[model samples]
Target chain A: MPMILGYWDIRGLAHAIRLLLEYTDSSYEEKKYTMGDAPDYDRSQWLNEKFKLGLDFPNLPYLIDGAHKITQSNAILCYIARKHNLCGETEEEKIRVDILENQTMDNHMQLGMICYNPEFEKLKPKYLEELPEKLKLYSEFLGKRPWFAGNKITFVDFLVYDVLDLHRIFEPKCLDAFPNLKDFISRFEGLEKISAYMKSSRFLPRPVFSKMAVWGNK
Target chain B: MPMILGYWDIRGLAHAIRLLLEYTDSSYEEKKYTMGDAPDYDRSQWLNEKFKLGLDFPNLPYLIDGAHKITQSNAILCYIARKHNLCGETEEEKIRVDILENQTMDNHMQLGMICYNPEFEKLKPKYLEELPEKLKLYSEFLGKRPWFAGNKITFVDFLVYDVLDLHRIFEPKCLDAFPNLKDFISRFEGLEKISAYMKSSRFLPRPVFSKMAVWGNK
Candidate 1:
């Protein structure tokens, strides 16, 4: 539990890192913040603690690894992935994981950007229009291999799964066109720990994103 | 020169990787593509070669290193970094490198999004407003450290330098306020090979954003 993940309650970037922690059977503690309204939300928790924590790069989605602190969501994700040996077997496999990990993250960024863009209403439809192009890239990648990084599930699969879930949440029938992707989702969810967590009270409900300005709400 | 890095001649995502190759004295060939128009652009060169090269993910910014083929910009950067011994010295140092490397990418993504966003003119001002916010984060971290991944000149510096340069290019005087940032830019440019390459005829003169819808153009 000493490996503390500091982030808001929203599943934004932390969820992907959480997936790795959960999948790899790593014991970690979550320091979750409510982050209610826009005005004073961040100040009370993350922002106030950020500078005091003495992080090299003060930012959210930071991980306290014993004496050391690491920031950046992908860094945190890969940090845990490396610890649990979920990265890949070979350098090439690691490269494959890195490629997919970074590529899928861009889509997640696009999803999160909706709240900030003033043209959310116009951008939403435009974003959805390009979903297939963004998704087929993943599905085709999935087609070549069972796991994203190869035979054994790598950290990138969890990331790919997390993004795919976001897409599925936004557009229920989006994956209907890609059977491989639909199966990939099912396979990931069917993991024992992930399956149990998906049904538990701790599992975020239908609206994963809160009343805050998010893609779903915007 | 057998290792080939493929992408458009534009420095959108390939510049940092190119910097590492040039700095480390790595022998690599660039399969440059000139994209003048949308419909006939990517399909003609890099896109066409992407599939044929037999890369796992098969996308632009792909790399062919002998029998090994890889995709994604960051992955390619680290691939050579690992081979050329430019990555961090230790595991924690490597995480720090990955942290800064991935963090800097979001800024590059923001810069690249300028061409694609419909309300970019309106958004451009908003982005510029926070240039200090983004630049300062790197500057403060680079305050005393010789490089982003601590003491050594790891691969992450190339990425941080590339992102910082983009901001400096846009505003010209943006880094004048942040002495550390201004110094960082000057220091990176002073790298012997980098300086020479900047003056060479092979160097891209002016802003060449290929034939794609790029950040500033939109």
Candidate 2:
């Protein structure tokens, strides 16, 4: 039986999880609720079912591993990373991996909020400026390193790569200032499964937030 | 020799980790940079030293556990927990522990922003109104559990306990409606080491945040 990954059908939070699963050659089935501009977009679909799944913390972007169900997108990604030995080489490396993961998740929450705003395009100009300041922190950490955590690319590298690419989509020249991160992105693109995914139809280079097709020109 | 835990003198982000160390019978030396009403109030004192540390990624709230140094408050706490067997029994339980921790921290960043705002008192009313609604989610998650994650106390219990008290300091009756969380706090307050710390001179029931004497009447 295939493991189940649950979330709204939009690429939203589930996208990275799917990317990780495919990258790791891990098998899982998506249990998604199709959200539209219709009633599904009202959020009750996910909220309504959130507490019913018997999860200690019932949340979307959940993963069902055999008999156990886990929530929290980063936590789910983390579980998969550990299962496949992608966390890092050692305990200390795992600490660094987790720190980067949390950092990426923190960025995700802010970007998600900006993406969800009804007037995102209008609000986006200042966000573009504010965002790079935060992204600069990522660049600072990636300073001359091939990966964010260690010599090997951990799960966090995937999340970080996605956000940097997503921003590059919005602002084509956004990463020009961060040379190391720019090179890191290029290196990630050359990875086997990652390369395949980006070239495939499944790759969505557009809005996939809880808030509907929130912006464009990506 | 002692394990070195470093941060600004203000408890701020590192408070929960300190509480966890104390509660769990862990020992470490405090390496604090004091910030006050005088010239040092600006953050440069700490920022200057951040990049100098030999850490792979140095930030505030860093821990030097012997030769190993870890940054990020939650990561430090998780390390201490794993060392002391507080993480949880199963891989699944660890996910819940991490989820609750990450959840608390995301709320904390916003609370930190408001508390650090120049006119926190002026902004308190609307925040007072808005914060409880967020706290209500915490109440919902309490759902009659003595601990946040599993049957027994984990590292998250300390974080949850601190936030409930911190919010309660600002809004005394804030938890009056949430019987489960109220009981959870009361129960946590009665724990052996916890109660001793509460009544001790070392405990700062007052201004632990960058914002001075943030509240009273707790």
Candidate 3:
């Protein structure tokens, strides 16, 4: 029985999950929902069936595997990661994983704020100015480690990869100063499974946000 | 030696952590930093020693236990919870914990945005209007479980409690419609350690936001 992963047809919160699903070669199917064209961006495509899913919290990017129903992207990621023992090993590793997980979301949301805000043009400059400092923190944290969680490639690597990739797309030169981060990105993309997924039709590398967002609506 | 918990001298992100620390009776000390009066809201009290603390990512609400250093409120809570075996037992319990952990943050941030916004007056009405739907989801997710993560208490209960408490404070009558949630609050507060901590001078419950905010900044 394959798992069902439901979310809008975009790379938003589901990107990391999708990338991880591909990287792990997990048997899963995506139930993509599309928002109606803008002006209203009617969400009936999702709202109509949101409650019928038997989800406790009932949210998008959910994973339905038999009796286990989960929502919250991080929770979904952890669910899949637990099945594969990819959540970090040592106590220190787990601590690093937890910190980076929340930190990455904070950083991701900051960028999302700028990109999704109607004031993108006005806000981009400030975000760009602070970009180096933000990247520096991640660089310092990664600090010569092969993966964010020590030497092991945990689920956080997939998450950090997605966020960093978004920043790279937003500003191509963002990673120029951090060779390690650049290497990290290249290392992630170089994975055979990930590489193959990228070239496949199932890959969703665009529309990072919904139609209501000022950017990446298409 | 007591562990050191560092954060601004407010009950913002640290509220849940503080509650959990007291609930678990951990040997910990606080390193509270104060922000200067408004206009600049100077942060030198923390900035001077932020990077010196050996924190990799460097943010508030950090926990320092001997060689182990952690930041990010959730990570800090997890660290404390891990010590007490309060993370959750079964896989289902863990999934519930993870889901509520992230979901609580989303809810917390929404209220925070409103409280911190200069346009809080304009936003309050709409937030109030939709508050019931949001609370209903949490109520339904909780169902009849004694805690957010089934029969046993987990760190997420503290997280959920803090957010629900904040909403209650935001609008006093908000929880009137949900008896289970109200009962959950009473159950948590009835814990001996929590009751003692709330009455102790060490408890800092006011000023849920920073000085720049329009509400809960006292």
Candidate 4:
């Protein structure tokens, strides 16, 4: 039986998960939930069945492979990555992977904070102002290493790729200062499977967040 | 030589890391930085050398063992846990560990949002009102497992312990209805090393966040 991936019908947390699924050639089906439009933005579509899913700590972007039901985006990523030996090898690489896993999420959440806020225009400038420092840290961390987790293309690469892609879309010129980041994006996109997946009709890159956000909610 | 654990001079994110260090009987030392009083809360004590440290992504609550410099609290916990075989063992346990690790952080961040916000009075009621549902999910997820990760005492136990303890302090009676969670807290406190550490003069349980917070700043 194919694995089931559940989440809202958007390019939010599931971007990397979707990318990894394609890269691994996993047989899976998506159960996309759509929130109602504007005013109410009714989430009953989700709330009605949230508790009935049999998830330990029921949440979206969950993976149900038979009895192994899982939640938390990173956990889902790790679950898929573990099946393919993409979760880094060696002590050094593991440490690097763990750090980047959390670091990427931190940067991801910072961007989400601005995008999801009611004061997107008011907060956008500060986020953009601090964007370089954030990118510079990632640049320095990824310095000379082909991938975030040393030479190996661990699961974190998929994560970092998604976050970087979001930022690029957020500010068209944001990554101009960091050539390595740009190259990294190109190299990631060059992946045969990722390339095919991006071109596929299933790919969803816009509407980066949910309906409540002031930006990227289309 | 003792591994160096650095962070602000408060409980904050280091509680679990410290407890795990003590529980594992790992040789470690603390490098606590104190923020200056009121107004400016002069952070030069830490800012002066933040970048000087060899950490790839420098931040507080870092664990530096000789050449292995690490940051991100969860990553730091996993680093130490791996050395002692405290990270989950089987596939099921690993999935449980990963899910709770992220779930706990999500809940932790929600609490921090209210405590750190200037509108503490405005936010306190809603937080209290919704607290039970959050605790219920954890109680249900935990179910009958002795530890968050099935039978083994994985690192996430410490992580969950810290978060639950913080909530207990946050509302005093928050965990009253959840017998399992309350018992889990007791079971954790009853552990030999953890029990000893709590009694030790080195343990710092207050000041759950930074100086900017409206609560737990002392």
TM-score of model 4 vs. true structure:
0.98
TM-score of chain B of each: 0.90, 0.87, 0.99, 0.98
Please write out the lDDT profile of model 4 over residues B1-218, one tens digit for every residue: 99999999989889999999999999999999999877888999989989988988889889999989999999999999999998899999999899988999999999999998999989999998998898898898888989889998999999899889998888788898989999999899999999998999998998889898899986
Q: What are the runs in model 3 whose C-alpha is more than 4 Å off?
A: none
- Interface C-alpha root-mean-square deviation, candidates in order: 1.8, 2.8, 0.9, 0.8
Report the lDDT tens digits of candidate 1 across residue range A112-193.
7785566778888888898898888788777857788778887888888888988888889889999988888888888898
lDDT of all predictions: 0.77, 0.76, 0.92, 0.91
The list of candidate 4 runs beyond 4 A from truth reads none
Candidate 3 pairs with clashing backbones: none
TM-score of chain A of each: 0.90, 0.87, 0.98, 0.98
Winner on DockQ between 1 and 2 is 1
What C-alpha RMSD does candidate 4 show over the true interface residues after superposing them?
A: 0.8
lDDT of 2 by residue, A1-218 (tens): 78889987666667778888879987777777755464455766677787788675567888888777787788888788888888788776778776777667767767777676778778888888787777788898777778877688788888888788777876798889888888998898888898898898767554456545565412
What is the interface RMSD, in angstroms, for predicted model 2?
A: 2.8
Candidate closer to the true structure by DockQ (higher is better), 1 or 4: 4
Which parts of model 1 are misplaced by more than 4 Å?
A37-45, A113-133, A176-179, A210-215, B37-58, B114-128, B177-183, B208-218
DockQ winner between candidates 1 and 3: 3
Question: Scored by Cα lDDT, where does model 1 land?
Answer: 0.77
Q: Which ten residues in a row have the lowest lDDT in candidate 4 chain A?
A: A111-120
